[model samples]
Target chain A: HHQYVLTLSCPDRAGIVSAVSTFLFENGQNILDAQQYNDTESGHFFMRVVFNAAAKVIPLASLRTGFGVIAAKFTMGWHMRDRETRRKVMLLVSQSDHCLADILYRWRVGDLHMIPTAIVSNHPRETFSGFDFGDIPFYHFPVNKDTRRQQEAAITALIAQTHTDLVVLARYMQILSDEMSARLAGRCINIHHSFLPGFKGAKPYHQAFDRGVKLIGATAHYVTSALDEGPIIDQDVERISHRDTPADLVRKGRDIERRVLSRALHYHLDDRVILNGRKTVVFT
Target chain B: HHQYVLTLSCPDRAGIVSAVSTFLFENGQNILDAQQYNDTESGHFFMRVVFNAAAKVIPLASLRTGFGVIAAKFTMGWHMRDRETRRKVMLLVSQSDHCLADILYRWRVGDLHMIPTAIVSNHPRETFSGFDFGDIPFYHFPVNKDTRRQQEAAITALIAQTHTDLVVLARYMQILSDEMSARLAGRCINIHHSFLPGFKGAKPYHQAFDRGVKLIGATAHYVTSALDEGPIIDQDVERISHRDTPADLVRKGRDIERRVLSRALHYHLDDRVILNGRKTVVFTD
Candidate 1:
């Protein structure tokens, strides 16, 4: 391994960092960056490390295999990968394509270090008229209440077939079945519009305008079965005034949503977000 | 009037705009930048106009006096000032001087356009040893359990003596009495530390750290008798992480407080903020 990134979390204990650093040193690697946090309430320790192989003493496969005994000793959930490895991400969308378009543009440039495995949408292909999917596969599994179960099955089937490492709900407004939410668990990211003077149900922007809120915001988080009650990864707001009508608020909200989701996506890709209870620890 | 700013709010009705525009036109003034908003719920209309007397037919005093009859007909709360008029400001502070120091620096440069009337502190003058108040008067009205009322009385007496137009509580830790709050009402601004996880009472940054919050923020608002409960002017937050200790959070909090309070101060000086019942309307670009 010339360079590698590692992340792990487990019950709080001493010597975890010492053990990892000692192991890396023995394998002829030098630590480049390290971030650690201890949650006193949960009694858990989390760490993320980036190291470069100064003089490789073993193969990359052997390097990962050698760390298993230590991981098992701590009963830890961990991931190790080559620094250059690009994650295969699958993007899902519905009517709103603002987040979709933003992620695509960032991907086309070098801003995002990931490969698009596929683009899935519930609307027909013609709804996304101007998008340039290029060589990436596009699937439009039209969904309605009548065949909800069958449609979910097809989507999961595609997920398994494409070997997607991450799934992004880029303003995919459809509610995911509980089973799918549980299966995707820590891998799926979703973005939703929010307001300071909050509103529930539908037409949130109109509700905000009616209530005369002074700020509009967006939240990005990991998808769970609890609908919008997910572990928030990042949130941001744009100031509003009485002058902005509902339509104007909606236009401003799109900008906030795109930025918030893009930032959350970048944090996830960089392995900077760690789930903690019903919240998150984002090491920005 | 070569250039002036006119701000007014009144009962919602037609002809408010037409009347103001016609009055300015007849006075040989041209509107430069105008921002308006109508609160349908309150049935009130608010407008801010910046106009230049391109070819003034009357003096600035005459222009303001001429608008009185129109203002009375509409039952409006209004103020008109020459654009170059500098407001006299008073600042109050406690032990923490981050906000106090930043506002001073901004005022020293051209960033803030205000004239400092006085600098009041509950702590001794030696506490602010490094500050350069120039010629602005500095007063230390120490307050303790033995003489709280008398100390507050002295502060207000000074406020009235200085002819202060605005007062700012730049991280002044002490609470203002209900009487003082009411008297300062719309003319006073204060800044307080806040957290995403939420905290109250005292030592908010420490409480936030204990609660494992991921963001630290600050809010600047008008001072009301309800303590920290006032109409907000501006707010902002900075991301934090577990790596930061309570002390680090306090240091970071100073940064947010300075910026939030400074921005709010600028907004008020620019006449970009209007009180709307328990809230405020800020026309910021």
Candidate 2:
């Protein structure tokens, strides 16, 4: 009763699907489902396949060893992992912990099929007053102008030591240096307080309220050095009236922020999102 | 125990909310709810209030007479109608009747509180094939290129004869003339099978398919002489992938079209939509 998922991004060409299917069949793998994309714009092919190991349980290590020859021939970036294995997700946050609380709750309730490795915050644990974070390690790695790089290096080291597969910036109010962003690459997801390219600077709600905007939402994206301009994983908008003040926007924004971030994280855990240049091919 | 709704649009100024509330209070009406809006962009104010008669049943006829003085004083365009009255909705559709069918179902389930006046269509009755329309009068007003005007005239007459308060182009494929548009005015809403002004020429699905678009949607708007450009009541988009073909787009498009159109109609029926210049205020104020 073993299932595995293999995801790959490769140069697009004919027979890619056929070859993958043939390879899986030859290795005693029965594909339960497969989602494929041919990125004509990028000349790349992206695929996510969920398969079972037929009668005999086949280890991902063995599958990987056998698939390496085909992978090299296609010039593909690929990974075959056990679907039953849970991704180790490390949470990063600041003062506001709505997304943090939400992800923790979902994980606790088994809604988010991932393991929380650690919860790191720049703000003190006192900010999350009376919040029950039972059994999870909470680290307050506060940073200032003089010690910011030191804090970042500590957090980066923690990620490596914890063997974190996914770093979730759950409303983390700090910028990752270019090096940290590149180091995490597609593995780190952030909940942007505002919609990308909309309200990026400080006090986004006040900025939106002053602009008399009709809608406000949250975006979940991979962390990149280019600031908020990353491959957006998921975005959602909640309509607001002129009657909604700045404080009202912020309150409502927390709802959107948590929901959007949770959904995007789920998409990643389920292997449903594939990075496609500046955009994403999210299989619904 | 009578509930009435008073809707108004006027020049934005102070004391408008107070004036309306005061008037309703003076007329022996209990203020149940009031939603007010002051659009700074257009310097216009809009309000929709639902109130019940206090102790004594206040006749709309009497309410209108008394409210006329205040409406005139404020230079307001206003209507005081009995909320209990179901708006007479006349539906117009073409061969594809998904939107029409959805509206009828909602009405049947008592979700849509409206009295359907008539069902008019340019296609033949056979097109609906065994669609159990039961009791609701269905009109097959066929038309061609030469005499589209004659068919339009007959439909217009039918609408006037039926005392239709709202004309719904429930996925209706025909373009109404300027005169017909003006005649219906704010009373007629059309579900543009395509999202307004997007892929509008023809074969929109094929156009989107060729472009490898990631989204397809539907827009329901009031009909204006300026073609598809109208005060949008509602619009919704469905995410499509590079895999969906033209036919797949069309199939998924119907889901969006019917849902969007029905929602827009619901907003209108509840008096939640007020037309601004080229836009609409479709929300709680």
- Output DockQ, candidate 1: 0.21
What part of the reference interface contacts, as a 0 to 1 fraction, does candidate 2 reproduce? 0.03
Per-residue CA lDDT of model 2 for A131-173, tens digit only, reads 8778779999989888988999999899889889999988888
lDDT string for model 2 (B1-285, tens) is 767888888999889998999888877889888788787757889998999988567778988999999899999987778877999999999889888889988998888899998899988778885353778998889888888899998987888898889999988888898998998889989875542114546676666555444455666888889877677677666666656667788888888889989998999998887777666776643
What's the distance in Å from true for residue B228, model 2? 14
First chain TM-score for all predictions: 0.96, 0.94
**Which one is best on DockQ?**
1
Query: What is candidate 2's CAPRI-style docking category based on DockQ?
Result: incorrect
lDDT by residue for model 1 (B130-200), tens? 57577778888898877878998998888788888999999998888898889887899999876543555
Clashes in each model (backbone N, CA, C under 3 Å)? 0, 0
Pairs clashing in candidate 1? none
lDDT tens digits, residues A76-101, model 1?
A: 88888887888889999988889989
RMSD in Å for model 2: 7.3
lDDT of 2 at B267: 90
